[PDB]
Design a protein around this ligand. Structure first.
Ligand code: CA
Ligand code: CA
Ligand code: CL
Ligand code: CL
Ligand code: MG
Ligand code: MG
Ligand code: MG
Ligand code: ZN
Length: 411
């Protein structure tokens, strides 16, 4: 019920990285976070220490006693300290190669090598060169088969393209699942929301800085993995809080601080959006962070809201649900069972996520605002899939959401 994620971040380039780390930390019970790596990108080409992260983790240690009363599985402060390390200290592929290992690059290697069947995500909040150093070292020291196996267990989520090393990865390792997300600017909350709901809330709020340019431009790089019941982030066409990536595109260019650098790698492909795809989730996203900052400052469970818990057809697993059904049949999807741990009331909303599925037509859902819905599988849907989403919403303060996607493979 959790995904494995390692973040690499160019702390100091812009306050948004700090903002993003605060949100990730109050969401950390939903993940297996395995690295917080301070590194570079074209907006911050040199770095020397982890002091930004140290400061934020000190705040986390003050919030952790409260956070841990609100959900299971928050990582300990000691554990987070252990995975707070330096990555590459210089820029791009110019800091990749012989003698250039970092704590962060080695951390990535060790995570990918681990005997956990789950893949691991490595992200680029700045450049991707700490990931590139890891892959370069594996390529330089292991067999082809061992390199292919390594690549098969990795995924990269690159925000915007901020060094030439991400491009080097996409070009040289075409079997690596690689997203270069660019439509990361349309979902953000207001500065007043931040002041009132976030920054005022205790020690973690005090290390959440104001926006300089954009708020939390890098945050999609973990929201992609926030909701196992909504989306499998390795199926990048599904859509979810990190966006929807329907195809690979050629020559996806990075930011202006690396102009001219991508082109030497042509032709290369990267998954990227074909349409902004985060804003649709914004209400849920904003309410989520609001409630979690309440968790951070309330010592009593009773004093904050917690997410509702979906069940569909007596299946309580926090994962995408897969069903096979015949064309021209009706499928009952019953979310009775679902619960709320605060005793809130629930609202049920069923939708056809037609952007995400291979069926080209429309799909009728009866009683789509009720717990117990019925999906009409078209007679012409054979050989396609149909994605049906349950969105569950409580009436707590603020309203919190939960999801279950049902993927119906039609015969
Ligand atoms: Ca950044
Ligand atoms: Ca609730
Ligand atoms: Cl955007
Ligand atoms: Cl979408
Ligand atoms: Mg404060
Ligand atoms: Mg989406
Ligand atoms: Mg469709
Ligand atoms: Zn609050």
């Amino acid at each position: 019920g959790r995904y494995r994620v390692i973040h690499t971040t160019d702390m100091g380039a812009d306050p948004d990285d700090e903002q993003s780390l605060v949100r990730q930390l109050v969401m950390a019970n939903e993940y297996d976070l395995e690295g917080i790596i301070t590194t570079t990108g074209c907006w911050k080409k040199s770095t020397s220490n982890t002091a930004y992260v140290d400061r934020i983790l000190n705040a986390y240690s003050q919030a952790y006693p409260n956070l841990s009363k609100h959900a299971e599985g928050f990582p300990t402060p000691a554990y987070l300290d252990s995975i707070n390390v330096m990555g590459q200290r210089g820029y791009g592929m110019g800091d990749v190669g012989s003698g250039k290992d970092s704590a962060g690059s080695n951390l990535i290697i060790a995570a990918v090598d681990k005997d956990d069947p789950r893949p691991v995500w490595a992200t680029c909040w700045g450049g991707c060169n700490t990931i590139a150093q890891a892959v370069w070292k594996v390529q330089n020291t292991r067999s082809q088969a061992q390199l292919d196996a390594f690549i098969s267990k990795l995924r990269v989520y690159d925000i915007l393209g901020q060094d030439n090393a991400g491009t080097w990865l996409a070009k040289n390792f075409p079997n690596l699942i690689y997203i270069r997300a660019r439509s990361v600017y349309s979902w953000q909350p207001s500065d007043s929301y931040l002041d009132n709901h976030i920054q005022s809330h205790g020690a973690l709020g005090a290390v959440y800085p104001n926006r300089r340019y954009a708020t939390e431009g890098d945050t999609p790089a973990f929201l992609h993995m926030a909701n196992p019941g909504l989306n499998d982030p390795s199926v990048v066409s599904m859509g979810g809080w990190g966006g929807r990536f329907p195809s690979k595109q050629a020559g996806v260019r990075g930011m202006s601080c690396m102009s001219g650098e991508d082109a030497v790698y042509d032709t290369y492909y990267m998954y990227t959006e074909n349409g902004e795809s985060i804003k649709r989730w914004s209400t849920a996203i904003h309410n989520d962070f609001q409630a979690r900052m309440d968790w951070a400052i309330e010592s009593n469970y009773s004093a904050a809201n917690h997410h509702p818990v979906p069940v569909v057809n007596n299946d309580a697993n926090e994962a995408v649900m897969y069903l096979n059904a015949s064309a021209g049949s009706t499928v009952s999807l019953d979310a009775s069972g679902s619960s709320d741990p605060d005793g809130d009331s629930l609202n049920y909303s069923w939708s056809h996520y037609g952007e995400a599925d291979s069926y080209s037509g429309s799909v009728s859902i009866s009683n789509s605002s009720s717990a117990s819905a019925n999906v009409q599988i078209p007679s012409n849907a054979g050989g396609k899939d149909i994605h049906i989403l349950l969105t569950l919403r409580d009436n707590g303060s603020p309203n919190l959401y939960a999801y279950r996607r049902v993927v119906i493979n039609v015969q």
